[PDB]
DNA sequence: AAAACGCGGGGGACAGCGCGTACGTGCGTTTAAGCGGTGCTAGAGCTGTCTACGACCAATTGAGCGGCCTCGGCACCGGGATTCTGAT
DNA sequence: ATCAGAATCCCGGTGCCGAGGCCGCTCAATTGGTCGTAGACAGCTCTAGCACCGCTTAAACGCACGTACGCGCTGTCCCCCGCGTTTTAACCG
């Protein structure tokens, strides 16, 4: 299994399939799908990290779309890497304008 | 005791950032999307998942637009939001075809 | 016939936060996220190859694609481990 | 109009043009001399360019 | 019959948006803006269905109409 | 050397629509880049659509759907009409 | 020539060649290049017509960046097609 | 004619590229493209900023105006 | 001076007048240099990445155009 | 469970009026910069040889998908404690 | 400065549905080999965009002046809040 032999947890063969049937180039190199699998794996791990930490801080042991939404938006960077993305049934960060407070 | 104007408004704000369930009323949105697609193709067909996706992207649009409108009013030393605020928000955004 | 990154998201989560899980709808979001990032990276690699008169999407094309999609605080660590995977694959 | 004049000499006698209507309807697929010779060519099929 | 998107609904969406006060005309203008956005997404969706030859908009066709306008939706397939 | 540009063809169209007017090297470059952008966009749309329909071929109906999505409207009908006349007249010969 | 027999000013053959070489799909329909060339020709004709009209309004026989950009931006149709596009050396409406 | 000023722009571009790479060697066409794109961006942004001032009942643009324009665009 | 200041106050002025600005505040100029600065960082970053991939030691107008096209503002005129 | 009407009520809009910082506007300087012109030589951009690389094809099998089935866990409720809020 | 009255909040109880595990056998994976040809590499000719310097002169800098507008303050009165109450459309079997 190329996933095992490349030490990954994502499917080397599957990303190779998808690079084929997407018609992205006439040929696909041997190393490219492994690298792409690694990148996808690590992005997966990191967004899941933020989600799990959000769940723990919510005292709450389950990833739901709100938890993914906070994991995406609270990070200053992933907010705008997924800025054009809309996570389904994730609310918005609880921000309120300072002038819009009773005083 | 009579609540002063504004505090329950903040309360609804906080409640609706805490909550996450959809907020546009779903059967009226079904009727609206059905009659809006009718004009684009007679004898047209929707499913629940597709209508849910439309309603939910719609909710995303309107919350983002209201971020922009509120923020524009705040920049204009305005706490209310006005149609001019919405129009400005949109026409900087570029969706005013 | 459905095709998804189900067991792989599960395996990553059970590897890194063993006490947590991933719901069905959270999984659907995650599947869309993986498919979307894959489409963006692969499309950029294809465009890079077309620009460079290249008929192969090599690890170098994926290198440039990831470094050029993920803008800062990403694609330093991600590139380092991607290269680590490709290198020790070639070793093994 | 030159074709229909070469066919039906008496313009007042509409009946010939009426029966010719399908012909000119279905023959519009060619509108140039070179294309017409070339269509006789496609049906000639003599391994030609 | 545009009134289906009701005044409390626009109100609450604004409160999710952080609005503290809402002028009266916001409701009508907001429904109008909503109509425009809906036209924009339905046009692409029904186009995708006509491509598929089918009658019924699939969630995939929804997602693709939405990704056309640079507003990607996550969760509904991929 | 053989350069990849839509020079002569844009010239031909310009003389057809405005025989007196001419276009210079720079403006030909503007037209060439614009046509390449539009053409890349349509072809990418067609390929994406064939993919999402699991169809591994491209055709006039793919381009139908691509043009109809891309062109905003009130030239969508015109572009479809002229493309259709071209494709029926092709399939004849 | 496919274009000359087609009565379109754009290269159907070279469009087919690029569709093959662009990794867009493994096979390309016969009518797809024809349709795409037709739409490209139509859009170029429309923009060139508008540019020539702007040049006439400006009393100039020469179509310059300001003519092309002024056409694209005055015309709401092309404006919505190329709103997020910038024309080199092009002035403001 | 172009208004962001030629040689100053080229040197600004040179030191910006210096950080990303060394012995990096631009093209004249590349510099022209960069200047034209930046010109277009800034004219668009000042158009937005003037909208913002006009809505705030002001004729002179302001810092807050340009930051409003940016954080509604989204790059901020 | 440092070349960020090379973009002169009259240049910022002419930009604003083209975009329709009647008056410009003295605080505008620093921030215009800032937004110009960040946009150039982005576009040059993508362009240099393109060259580095191409094994080319010379930024190219096609690279700039490709970078701008990704950032969302296609530039016509320098195509090839 | 939510929308829709209605009433009094507070809060804030909008307009006006003043003052003063800030702005635009000359006035010419000093500055620097087209738009020529110098001499490079980095490094294209192109060709040609030959290798490892990758694309297809059987043959073999083990990861994934759908189906099926449990039971933790979340949403739910009432009831109880926490809480930020004027009001006088 | 103070405490009454709504909303928010803590815990834990019971019910239900989906998550996560298991099972089979489908399908594409994984060797193993072969062939063609795309790229790496080496090498050459030639482009072109440095680095600077003239020279004229448009443009930028600095400074000084006058006044149109930014921001603040005050005042009035339209226009919403924030309930309570009464319809109403919707709710999910």
Residue numbers in the entry:
A (entry chain c): 16 to 118
B (entry chain e): 39 to 135
C (entry chain d): 30 to 121
D (entry chain B): 295 to 343
E (entry chain f): 25 to 102
F (entry chain h): 29 to 121
G (entry chain g): 16 to 108
H (entry chain a): 59 to 134
Direct quotes from the study:
Efficient transcription of RNA polymerase II (Pol II) through nucleosomes requires the help of various factors. Here we show biochemically that Pol II transcription through a nucleosome is facilitated by the chromatin remodeler Chd1 and the histone chaperone FACT when the elongation factors Spt4/5 and TFIIS are present. In the second structure, Pol II has generated a partially unraveled nucleosome that binds FACT, which excludes Chd1 and Spt5. These results suggest that Pol II progression through a nucleosome activates Chd1, enables FACT binding and eventually triggers transfer of FACT together with histones to upstream DNA.
The structure shows that Pol II adopts the active post-translocated state and has transcribed 27 bp into the nucleosome, as observed biochemically. The structure shows that Chd1 binds the partially unwrapped nucleosome.
